[PDB]
A paper describes a structure:
Snake filaments have a crossover distance of 650 Å and vary in width between 40 and 100 Å. A pronounced offset of the centre of the ordered core from the helical axis explains the sigmoidal appearance of the filaments in projection. The structure has a helical twist of −1.26°, an overall resolution of 3.3 Å, and a clear separation of β-strands along the helical axis. The ordered core of the snake filament comprises residues 272–330, i.e. the last three residues of R1, all of R2 and most of R3. In the core, there are six β-strands, three from R2: β1 (274–280), β2 (282–291) and β3 (295–298), and three from R3: β4 (305–310), β5 (313–321) and β6 (327–330). Four of these strands form two stacks of cross-β, with β1 packing against β5 and β2 against β4. A broad, hammerhead-like arc, harbouring β3, connects β2 to β4. The hammerhead arc represents a new type of chain direction reversal in [name] filaments, different from the triangular β-helix of the Alzheimer fold, and the tighter U-turns of the Pick fold. Most of the positively charged side-chains are exposed on the filament surface, where they face diffuse external densities (indicated by yellow arrows), presumably corresponding to negatively charged groups of heparin.
Author numbering:
A (entry chain B), B (entry chain A), C (entry chain C): 272 to 330
């Protein structure tokens, strides 16, 4: 058959926080969570594929 | 047959927070959750596919 | 047959928070939930597909 694959994976911000079996005392704690900021992102890409014919031809 | 695949995966902000079996005391805690901000994003991409014929032709 | 696939997955903000079997005391806690803000997003993309014929032709 013949495949053409063009794959763009750009911006990924992942954040995995876990606590298990915690028997603790917490007092006066700022900034314990999570923050994700993306500021003024411009995504100006071009993707072309000048391709021939596909499928089945008989003569 | 013949495939053409063009895939753009751009902006992904994932956030996974979990707590299991927590037997704890929490006092005066700011910023424990999660924040996701995207500010003024401009997505100005072009994707073309000048392609031939597809399917089945007989002569 | 012959496929053409053009896929744009752009902005994804996911947020998964879970608590299991929690036997705890919580006092005076701001910002425990979740926030998702998208500010002034402009999505100005172009996608073309100058393609040939599809299907079945006989001569």
């Amino acid at each position: 058959g013949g495949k053409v694959q063009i794959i763009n994976k750009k911006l990924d911000l992942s954040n995995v926080q876990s606590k298990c079996g915690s028997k603790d005392n917490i007092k006066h704690v700022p900034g314990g969570g999570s923050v994700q900021i993306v500021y003024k992102p411009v995504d100006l890409s071009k993707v072309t594929s000048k391709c021939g014919s596909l499928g089945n031809i008989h003569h």
